[PDB]
Amino acid sequence: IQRTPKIQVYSRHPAENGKSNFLNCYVSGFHPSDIEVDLLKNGERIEKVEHSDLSFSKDWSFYLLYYTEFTPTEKDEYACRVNHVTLSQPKIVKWDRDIGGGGGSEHVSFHVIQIFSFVNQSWARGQGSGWLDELQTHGWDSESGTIIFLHNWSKGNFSNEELSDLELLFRFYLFGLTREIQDHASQDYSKYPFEVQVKAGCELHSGKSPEGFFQVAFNGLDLLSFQNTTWVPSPGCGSLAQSVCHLLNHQYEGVTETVYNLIRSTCPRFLLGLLDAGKMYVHRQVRPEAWLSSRPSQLLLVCHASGFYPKPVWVTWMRNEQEQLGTKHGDILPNADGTWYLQVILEVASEEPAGLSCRVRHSSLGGQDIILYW
Amino acid sequence: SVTQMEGPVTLSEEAFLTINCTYTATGYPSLFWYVQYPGEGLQLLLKATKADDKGSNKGFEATYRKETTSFHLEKGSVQVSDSAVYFCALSDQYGWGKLQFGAGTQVVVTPDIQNPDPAVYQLRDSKDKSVCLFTDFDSQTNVSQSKDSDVYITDKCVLDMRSMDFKSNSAVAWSNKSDFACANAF
Amino acid sequence: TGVSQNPRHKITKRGQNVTFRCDPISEHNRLYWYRQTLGQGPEFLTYFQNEAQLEKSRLLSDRFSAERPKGSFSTLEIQRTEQGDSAMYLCASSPRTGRGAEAFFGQGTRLTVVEDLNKVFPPEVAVFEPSEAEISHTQKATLVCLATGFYPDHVELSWWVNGKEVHSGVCTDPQPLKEQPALNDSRYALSSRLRVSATFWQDPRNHFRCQVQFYGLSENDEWTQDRAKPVTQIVSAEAWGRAD
Ligand SMILES: *[C@@H]1O[C@H](CO)[C@@H](O[C@@H]2O[C@H](CO)[C@@H](O)[C@H](O)[C@H]2NC(C)=O)[C@H](O)[C@H]1NC(C)=O
Ligand SMILES: *[C@@H]1O[C@H](CO)[C@@H](O)[C@H](O)[C@H]1NC(C)=O
Ligand SMILES: *[C@@H]1O[C@H](CO)[C@@H](O)[C@H](O)[C@H]1NC(C)=O
Ligand SMILES: CCCCCCCCCCCC
Ligand SMILES: CCCCCCCCCCCC
Ligand SMILES: [Ca+2]
């Protein structure tokens, strides 16, 4: 299936003319992964923009955060431009400082993801990364075929010897899976292009001990997963899923055994050691900064909170202790440093409409809410 | 990553063979013994891909013992044709990696000579030049080294007249010199 | 049937480049080069998965380079050979049959890097006829073959009886000995025995030939010495049975 990109543009800090800041563009909900994203200043692409490593969500749809240092002024216009197969022409979302542009059992998860993009018989690409929940802990350098340790504690309690062995295994695996798929696909060219995603790792749920998983998607839909010792086809992907599970269950018992030990024995060890080593960083508290803005629609009042970590937060418009319903909660969006951003909108009538305020509540604030008066 | 017993190991036909091998690994390696017969290339003897698996071949066995990180080679009753070099090996990357070999252990299996008849003979060139042959001695005889740098003495060699079910040890000695006599050579 | 390597042997002068070739079992995606020096275990050099060189030894000299352009045959090149490069170069291949797959080894390329090609010599070969005393005491007859004066130690000795190679009743020294052990460039000697029944020796129709295949210089090697160029060659000696 294909999914059109969602595009959201925001600044890391409140805009102050002449003062340096970061411009962020979050591109999400898209499929396939092939995408072009630029940040524009007055219609011209900014060089030396950075971006997060390609990731994807629960529904397999891809997400990327683009960011650059910028200095807003009164006059300068910034935007995010995206092109993608779902779009007949590039889509430009402007940054507006006033309004921007655009589960159950509690658990932690360590997992590796892979994205395999098969463009044609002569061209395929494998990429991947490691994640503690939504935090990236590991990258993968394609050229050298090596693990990139992103944090000082990214080795968990694993030895360099163990990590080197895993690294070599992953290198052989990425190359081999890509080639094996290309060999099957070279017998019918009209299947091209297509994409394969893997998510594999282990989860610690409250009340349970670690559980491994290995999940696969094809063109953005569940294809199959590893259940106990059996590759099980997604009910959703019918005949192709059945074929692939038959291959995996009957011609690759060595692969099966390797996946089993990795997700059921090595991954739990890795997860527990990683949480432990990264304790201080993962359970840190970072206070949000907060500010108000408005635009005409009747005003929209907009309350912003940016720079908070961890993610749970509560932001609401209040008319003297009365919480205003009619408040639109935006998405919680990432900043490049791992903190988060949120705006909350209230549509109002009249002028300055007596005592409106915005209340920001967050674990980091030591029981002292930020209250901003309009 | 693989340490094995230093040889050579010399033993008699029908004696028990043990070649120690210990490994170091964090992951899930597959373990193996390779053998190289005289004049030949390397070939797999036996293997084990997980803890407590036993590989066996032609009377040889080795058990993957994770808790002593060992894969010791054993054969209850060695045969003369077992004379060879044995290499312990491991494949890391969960059994997908390159073979990593120990230093290897030579095994020399001596025959049980049914009826020893030790004798020294002189043989003439088919074209006065001569060599000496010490033959038919038992497998426990030492053939001592040459003292003279102008006199050469080979190691013992085991030959098998298979169709006659008969094995014999021998060593050859020769020299350039005019005083060379077989009487003294061995 | 198995993994094929060429050339089986290579003698070269220090400083020259050499290229070796491996043809793995077809369909094997995994190919490995290793080096083995007499009396030790193979040391890993490099690994291909299909055409891709996915792992090289950290110790691999920069003089060494391998390729496998079409995921099939592979070449190993050594630039500016050194004496320490002298070793057996092994190629092996493995299928994707699973964890702990068998690696299938070639017979190797034996490399000998010499200081000077004028130290290369072919063997002289003689056959020594059975002792009368052995014949009357045991009713057996041992022939001895002696190959002397050769360098390097690349030889294969075979016995031929009436035009056919025999293995039974044969014992060849496992290692050549050095004629002058004090020298690093010593020439070598090798002996072999062929034992037969007295009656087989004592038949004048029987023909016994000791053959020594020597691996020496090749066509392209330059030679300016007086003596015959010590090329790869066979040197033989023989005897005929005698009634008595
Ligand atoms: C890293 O941390 C984990 C968690 O403590 C260690 O794994 C546990 O080891 C203890 C002691 O052997 C066992 O009782 C637990 O059952 C293990 N938990 C598992 C396997 O999930 C682990 O040994 C540490 N080191 C490494 C190298 O992983
Ligand atoms: C295959 O796709 C690659 C990547 O887009 C491209 O560079 C190449 O020209 C394509 N070849 C075709 C269209 O056969
Ligand atoms: C899981 O698989 C093993 C191996 O077949 C089996 O013995 C065990 O009973 C299974 N557990 C499940 C799926 O109930
Ligand atoms: C490491 C190798 C994993 C093997 C995966 C095989 C998938 C190809 C099946 C295509 C079916 C039409
Ligand atoms: C043309 C069909 C492509 C589907 C390939 C599925 C890959 C499964 C991964 C197996 C895990 C080792
Ligand atoms: Ca005995």
Numbering used by the authors:
A (entry chain B): 2 to 103, 113 to 307, 312 to 388
B (entry chain D): 3 to 129, 132 to 190
C (entry chain E): 2 to 245
Give the published text:
The cell surface glycoproteins CD1 (cluster of differentiation 1), are a family of non-polymorphic antigen presenting molecules that present lipid antigens, and include the group 1 (CD1a, b and c), and group 2 (CD1d) CD1 molecules. Generally, the hydrophobic acyl chains are anchored in the CD1 binding pocket created by the α1-α2 domains whereas the hydrophilic head groups are protruding at the CD1 surface, where they are available for recognition by the TCR. The structure of CD1c bound to mycobacterial mycoketides revealed distinctive features of the CD1c antigen binding groove Specifically, the CD1c A’ pocket is continuous with the F’ pocket, creating a structure that opens externally through accessory gaps called the D’ and E’ portal. We then solved the co-complex crystal structure of a CD1c-restricted TCR that could bind to a broad CD1c-bound lipid-repertoire, revealing the molecular basis of lipid-agnostic TCR recognition of CD1c.
The S2cWT bound to CD1c molecules loaded with endogenous lipids (CD1c-endo) and purified from human embryonic kidney (HEK) cells with an average affinity (KD) of 16.7 μM (as measured by surface plasmon resonance), which is in the typical range for classical TCR-pHLA interactions. To better understand the molecular basis for these binding characteristics, we solved the structure of the S2cWT-CD1c-endo trimolecular complex to 2.04Å. The TCR bound to CD1c centrally, with a similar diagonal docking angle (43.3°) compared to the previously reported CD1c-restricted 3C8 TCR, with the CDR1 and 2 loops positioned over the CD1c α-helices and the CDR3β loops directly over the CD1c F’-portal, seemingly primed to make contacts with the lipid head group. Analysis of the S2cWT TCR footprint demonstrated that most contacts were focused over the CD1c A’-roof, with substantial contacts along the length of the CD1c helix 1. This binding footprint resulted in a buried surface area of 1015 Å, within the normal range for TCR-pHLA and other TCR-CD1 interactions, with the TCR α-chain contributing to just over half of the interface. Interface analysis demonstrated that the TCR α-chain dominated contacts, mediated largely by interactions between the CDR1α and CDR3α loops with both the CD1c helices. TCR β-chain contacts were mostly driven by CDR2β to CD1c helix 1, with additional contacts from CDR3β to both helices and CDR1β making no contribution to the interface. We did not observe clear density for the lipid head group(s), likely because a mixture of lipids is bound to CD1c-endo molecules. In fact, the two copies of the S2cWT-CD1c-endo molecule observed in the asymmetric unit of the crystal structure showed significant difference in the density of the lipid head group region. This flexibility in accommodating various lipid head groups stems from the two different side chain conformations adopted by CD1c F67, with larger lipid head groups likely requiring F67 to adopt the outward facing conformation.
